[PDB]
UniProtKB/Swiss-Prot annotation:
It comes from Bacillus subtilis (strain 168). The lineage of its organism: Bacteria, Bacillati, Bacillota, Bacilli, Bacillales. Negative regulator of sigma-B activity. Dephosphorylates RsbS. Plays a role both in maintaining low sigma-B activity during growth and in reestablishing prestress sigma-B activity after induction. Could have a negative feedback role by indirectly communicating sigma-B protein levels. Its EC number is 3.1.3.3. The keyword Ion transport does not apply. One of its GO terms (biological process) is response to heat. Residues 11-198 form the PPM-type phosphatase domain. This is Phosphoserine phosphatase RsbX. The keyword Transferase does not apply. One of its GO terms (molecular function) is L-phosphoserine phosphatase activity. SUPFAM superfamilies: PP2C-like. It is an enzyme of class 3 (hydrolase). It catalyses: O-phospho-L-serine + H2O = L-serine + phosphate; O-phospho-D-serine + H2O = D-serine + phosphate. Keywords: Hydrolase, Protein phosphatase. Pfam families: SpoIIE (PF07228).
């Protein structure tokens, strides 16, 4: 599955593929862009089958419903929603276009990389654990981005030797997605990514 979107401030591409032969995807995503801001999230439910999907889908629904809140607040709602569920790893990104500012919060192994034309990268390390409903050691990042910056959020089904280099080389989200095709073919898991190129 691919979805492409564009407005004055961002071009995005979402890609999602189930593990081959698997009908029920355990990953979820949400994305909404308007003229002022972007919110997106990617989640990977623990375990297998419908129960993994239940966990990541609940995150998708909460991010959509609570999009207006700070990422810190949204991720806490998501944690609380994981009580009595499988749990999920998840990352949430909000971007304010006029300010060229982003805010990012994550628990678990969903990765985020933002590359700026100047060579500046933001590539935070994963926080261990997962959203479980138990207390978390949350870490939020707020930073400015420069025009031309490109980013990816991806689940652990995407196995790529050097993702920063793909963001640097590719000049559009389509080019970057095409350069990743050879790694999507070798997946052993559900694979979801969101690419963006910021004006
Ligand atoms: Mg996975």
């Amino acid at each position: 599955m691919i979805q492409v979107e564009e407005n004055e401030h961002i071009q995005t591409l979402v890609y999602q593929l189930n593990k081959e032969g698997k009908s029920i995807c355990g990953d979820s995503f949400f994305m909404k862009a308007d003229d002022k801001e972007l919110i997106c999230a990617v989640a990977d439910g623990l375990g297998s089958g419908s129960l993994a999907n239940e966990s990541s889908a609940a995150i998708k629904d909460l991010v959509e419903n609570y999009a207006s809140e700070d990422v810190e607040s949204i991720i806490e709602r998501c944690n609380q929603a994981m009580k009595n569920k499988r749990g999920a790893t998840a990352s949430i990104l909000k971007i304010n276009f006029e300010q060229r500012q982003f805010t990012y919060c994550s628990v678990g192994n969903v990765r985020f990389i933002l590359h700026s034309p100047s060579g500046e990268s933001f590539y935070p390390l994963p926080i261990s654990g997962y959203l479980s409903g138990k207390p978390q050691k949350y870490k939020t990042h707020t930073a400015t981005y420069e025009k031309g910056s490109k980013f990816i959020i991806h689940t652990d089904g995407l196995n790529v030797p050097d993702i920063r280099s793909h963001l640097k080389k590719g000049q559009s989200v389509e080019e970057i997605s095409n350069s990743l095709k050879m790694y999507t073919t070798s997946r052993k898991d559900d694979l979801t990514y969101i690419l963006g190129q910021l004006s």
